[PDB]
């Protein structure tokens, strides 16, 4: 292989190691189109996980930058060379949304400063800011003509699948003195996060969850009934990266909505999914 194929492989190679689910589906794309998501998803999540100082944050985005303003021109990177390599190959070839990457950076900057949302406007701001951002930066390679249409639904999808993975994670993130229900709907079903985490589930507790699930539930629905604005080939496989992903909703209900382990879709369900979707098209 080429050395631009190594740095595709590495790209690869964290987006498999970061999520089990989204590259079993994103897998799937034709060469050239997975290739270029592996790409955009390994810089998102260099950029997620920079701080553990803001000095690395900082060459990425320097390094989004000069791709931005010289995209055929050689660039010593300051991050990640492989990684921005790949993004300012694909740069080459796609139009990418640069400013959703400063936006995503941007949240990850403020995450510095972390206090709890005070109502659901604001989490779901944060859901735009690492995760609609995503799906925005993803949308050109995933569809034929892109519309105001194509990125609302990209946005949308990208949305409900950080809500999911805040409703696996409640635990973890808890552990990680993170706590991302807002305090409005915390006061309003009467929960405290840190008591349930000592005591275990409640009632109040799972309709609170609850609450939150039925709104990425229907999001996801909304974003099924318009999937047709991505290309063909990308239809079924983000249909099954959005199933993969939702189908954790019942596993967490599955597991009584604990707060002590990080649920998961084994792969066998996951290649259930693919089935069942891949004979719908
Ligand atoms: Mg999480």
Redesign the pocket.
């Known amino acids: 292989m080429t050395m631009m194929d190594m740095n595709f492989k590495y790209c690869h190679k964290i987006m498999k190691k970061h999520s089990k689910s989204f590259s079993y589906a994103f897998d799937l794309l034709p060469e050239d189109q997975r290739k270029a998501v592996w790409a955009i998803y390994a810089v998102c999540r260099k950029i997620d996980d920079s701080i553990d100082d803001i000095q690395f944050l900082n060459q990425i985005k320097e390094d989004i930058q000069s791709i931005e303003k010289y995209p055929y021109e050689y660039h010593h990177f300051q991050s990640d060379r492989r990684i921005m390599m790949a993004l300012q190959h694909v740069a080459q070839h796609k139009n990418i949304a640069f400013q959703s990457f400063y936006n995503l950076i941007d949240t990850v900057y403020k995450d510095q400063h972390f206090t709890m949302f005070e109502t659901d406007a604001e989490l779901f701001g944060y859901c735009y800011g690492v995760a609609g951002t995503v799906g925005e930066v993803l949308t050109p390679i995933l569809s034929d003509h892109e519309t105001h249409q194509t990125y609302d639904v990209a946005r949308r999808l990208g949305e409900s699948l950080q809500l999911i993975?805040?409703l696996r994670?409640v635990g973890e993130?808890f552990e990680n003195e993170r706590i991302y229900f807002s305090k409005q709907r915390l006061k309003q079903y009467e929960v405290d996060i840190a008591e349930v985490y000592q005591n275990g589930v409640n009632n109040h507790y799972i309709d609170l969850w609850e609450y939150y699930a039925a709104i990425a539930e229907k999001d996801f629905r909304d974003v099924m009934d318009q999937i047709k604005v991505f290309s063909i080939e990308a239809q079924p496989i983000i249909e099954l990266a959005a199933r993969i992903y939702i189908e954790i909703l019942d596993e967490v209900r599955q597991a009584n909505y604990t707060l002590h382990e990080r649920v998961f879709v084994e792969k066998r369900k996951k290649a259930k999914l693919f089935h069942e979707i891949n004979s719908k098209y």
């Open positions: 993975n805040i994670d993130d």
